[PDB]
Design an enzyme around this catalytic site. Structure first.
Site, short mmCIF file in Angstrom:
data_model
loop_
_atom_site.label_atom_id
_atom_site.label_comp_id
_atom_site.label_asym_id
_atom_site.label_seq_id
_atom_site.Cartn_x
_atom_site.Cartn_y
_atom_site.Cartn_z
N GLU A 13 0.76 -1.24 0.00
CA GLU A 13 0.00 0.00 0.00
C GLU A 13 0.79 1.29 0.00
O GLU A 13 0.23 2.37 0.26
CB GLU A 13 -0.97 0.02 1.17
CG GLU A 13 -2.02 -1.02 1.09
CD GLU A 13 -2.65 -1.27 2.44
OE1 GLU A 13 -1.87 -1.47 3.39
OE2 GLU A 13 -3.91 -1.24 2.54
N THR A 18 -1.02 3.55 -7.77
CA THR A 18 -1.65 4.85 -7.94
C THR A 18 -0.74 5.68 -8.87
O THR A 18 -1.21 6.42 -9.73
CB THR A 18 -1.96 5.49 -6.53
OG1 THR A 18 -2.82 4.60 -5.82
CG2 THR A 18 -2.73 6.85 -6.65
N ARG A 148 -8.61 1.01 -4.46
CA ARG A 148 -7.62 0.10 -3.92
C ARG A 148 -7.82 -1.36 -4.29
O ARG A 148 -8.87 -1.95 -4.00
CB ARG A 148 -7.49 0.18 -2.40
CG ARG A 148 -7.28 -1.19 -1.77
CD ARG A 148 -6.09 -1.30 -0.88
NE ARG A 148 -4.85 -1.28 -1.63
CZ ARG A 148 -3.93 -2.24 -1.60
NH1 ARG A 148 -4.08 -3.32 -0.85
NH2 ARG A 148 -2.85 -2.08 -2.35
N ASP A 170 4.94 -2.45 -12.39
CA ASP A 170 4.23 -2.39 -11.10
C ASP A 170 4.10 -3.82 -10.51
O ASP A 170 3.80 -4.78 -11.23
CB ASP A 170 2.84 -1.74 -11.37
CG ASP A 170 1.97 -1.62 -10.10
OD1 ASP A 170 2.50 -1.34 -9.01
OD2 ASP A 170 0.77 -1.84 -10.22
N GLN A 174 3.52 -6.40 -0.79
CA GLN A 174 3.30 -7.19 0.44
C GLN A 174 4.30 -8.36 0.50
O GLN A 174 4.77 -8.83 -0.54
CB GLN A 174 1.85 -7.63 0.57
CG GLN A 174 1.02 -6.47 1.19
CD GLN A 174 -0.46 -6.73 1.34
OE1 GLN A 174 -0.94 -7.84 1.18
NE2 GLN A 174 -1.20 -5.68 1.64
N1 LIG Z 1 -4.41 10.15 0.73
C1 LIG Z 1 -3.64 9.41 -0.04
N2 LIG Z 1 -4.03 8.17 -0.40
C2 LIG Z 1 -3.09 7.56 -1.22
C3 LIG Z 1 -1.87 8.08 -1.66
N3 LIG Z 1 -1.19 7.13 -2.45
C4 LIG Z 1 -1.99 6.10 -2.48
N4 LIG Z 1 -3.16 6.26 -1.77
C5 LIG Z 1 -4.27 5.31 -1.60
O1 LIG Z 1 -3.72 4.22 -0.90
C6 LIG Z 1 -4.28 2.99 -1.24
C7 LIG Z 1 -3.01 2.07 -1.42
O2 LIG Z 1 -2.16 2.51 -2.52
P1 LIG Z 1 -1.91 1.54 -3.83
O3 LIG Z 1 -1.48 2.39 -4.95
O4 LIG Z 1 -2.95 0.52 -4.02
O5 LIG Z 1 -0.58 0.88 -3.19
P2 LIG Z 1 0.54 -0.24 -3.58
O6 LIG Z 1 1.76 0.22 -2.92
O7 LIG Z 1 0.46 -0.28 -5.04
O8 LIG Z 1 0.00 -1.59 -2.93
P3 LIG Z 1 0.39 -3.16 -3.16
O9 LIG Z 1 -0.10 -3.59 -4.45
O10 LIG Z 1 1.89 -3.06 -3.07
S1 LIG Z 1 -0.48 -4.07 -1.75
C8 LIG Z 1 -5.20 3.32 -2.41
O11 LIG Z 1 -6.50 3.37 -1.93
C9 LIG Z 1 -4.75 4.66 -2.84
O12 LIG Z 1 -5.64 5.49 -3.56
C10 LIG Z 1 -1.49 9.42 -1.26
O13 LIG Z 1 -0.47 10.07 -1.54
N5 LIG Z 1 -2.46 10.01 -0.42
MG LIG Z 2 -0.43 -2.01 -5.96
#
Ligand SMILES: Nc1nc2c(ncn2[C@@H]2O[C@H](COP(=O)(O)OP(=O)(O)OP(O)(O)=S)[C@@H](O)[C@H]2O)c(=O)[nH]1
Ligand SMILES: [Mg+2]
Length: 323
Positions: A13, A18, A148, A170, A174
């Site tokens: 996450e 994103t 998400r 990408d 986890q």
């Molecule tokens: N407020 C806020 N929410 C964010 C930001 N970056 C991501 N999010 C929110 O966080 C959630 C997790 O981010 P996501 O992009 O799914 O992470 P990830 O790192 O790709 O996750 P994974 O696949 O490794 S489990 C999503 O709901 C997303 O919109 C940010 O800068 N600010």
């Molecule tokens: Mg992701």
């Protein structure tokens, strides 16, 4: 045309996917109406899972409702969740959710999010449930951006930017999704490592006994000082600056860093976090790692941070396309 193989890495996450959605908007064709409609089921599922988690935490955290009647709504909700069509949101459901969110006990629990596991966009969707549920609802880009879905495979994004043909990958961050990372380390021009600023008081979904930022720091340490990356440009996105901003004023950075000293402030504690990550760079003398405070959900921000990132790629010309 130069081919740039780019890897998005960071813990769960952290915001990697994103940044992918942003590249679609900024550098590709953006979202079509039909793609937007595909996110409704995701948005609706995220709204449901976020409220159920706050309700659930009412108990584990020993928190009473500001109105014992909401207890009736909670059960009914729990029941509907196992009976509704996945990804849907009937009026009967959002009415209940609208009352629970309006409850001060629920609001007390929501505020204690750090104490359990809750989606980032929980408050974002719950607070705006009315709109999301207004008949004729088709999501906006921020809605889509707030979406998400845990990444379980690998996803490639290709676009041309400033005459470089990006090949961006990408992957889930986890613990169990890291196992495959090794097969992707071949021929990496650049890595944007993502760390959530706001994760300093959270705990892992994988092990509730592991702080999220220490894990992130360990991973960074392993990636940053990795064989394959000898050349490889590495950038650190200290992400979710918006949430860190609201959070810093309430939670002590000392909860993460027991030795942390200064004013638990944004400019000051944000910088401390930059250092804890950058100190890890065993090649700081020779290498210099570009980091930045970012909000992945903020289109113009990502648009400007990426342009700077790519100016680096262009500058410190190096290795490219793998295999
Ligand atoms: N407020 C806020 N929410 C964010 C930001 N970056 C991501 N999010 C929110 O966080 C959630 C997790 O981010 P996501 O992009 O799914 O992470 P990830 O790192 O790709 O996750 P994974 O696949 O490794 S489990 C999503 O709901 C997303 O919109 C940010 O800068 N600010
Ligand atoms: Mg992701």
């Amino acid at each position: 045309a130069r081919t740039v193989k780019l890897l998005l890495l960071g813990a769960g996450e952290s915001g990697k996917s994103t940044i992918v959605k942003q590249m679609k908007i900024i550098h590709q064709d953006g979202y079509s109406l039909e793609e937007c409609l595909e996110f409704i089921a995701i948005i609706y599922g995220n709204t449901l899972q976020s409220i159920l988690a706050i309700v659930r935490a009412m108990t584990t955290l020993n928190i009473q409702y500001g109105d014992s009647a909401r207890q009736d709504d909670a059960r009914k909700l729990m029941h509907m969740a196992d009976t509704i069509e996945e990804g849907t949101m009937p009026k009967e459901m959002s009415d209940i959710i609208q009352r629970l969110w309006k409850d001060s006990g629920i609001q007390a629990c929501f505020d204690r999010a750090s104490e359990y596991q809750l989606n980032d966009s929980a408050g974002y969707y719950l607070s705006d449930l009315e709109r999301l549920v207004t008949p004729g609802y088709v999501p906006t880009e921020q809605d889509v951006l707030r979406s998400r879905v845990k990444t379980t495979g690998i996803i490639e994004t290709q676009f041309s930017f400033k005459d470089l043909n990006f090949r961006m990958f990408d992957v889930g961050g986890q613990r169990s999704e890291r196992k495959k990372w090794i097969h992707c380390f071949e021929g990496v021009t650049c890595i944007i490592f993502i760390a959530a600023l706001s994760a300093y008081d959270m705990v892992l979904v994988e092990d509730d006994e592991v702080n999220r930022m220490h894990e992130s720091l360990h991973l960074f340490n392993s990636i940053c000082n990795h064989r394959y990356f000898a050349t490889t440009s590495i950038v650190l996105f200290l992400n979710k600056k918006d949430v860190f901003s609201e959070k810093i004023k309430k939670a002590h950075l000392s909860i993460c860093f027991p030795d942390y000293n200064g004013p638990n402030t944004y400019e000051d504690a944000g910088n401390y976090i930059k250092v804890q990550f950058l100190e890890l760079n065993m090649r700081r003398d020779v290498k210099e790692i570009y980091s930045h405070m970012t909000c992945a959900t903020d289109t113009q921000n990502v648009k400007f941070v990426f342009d700077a990132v790519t100016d680096i790629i262009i500058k410190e010309n190096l290795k490219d396309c793998g295999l």
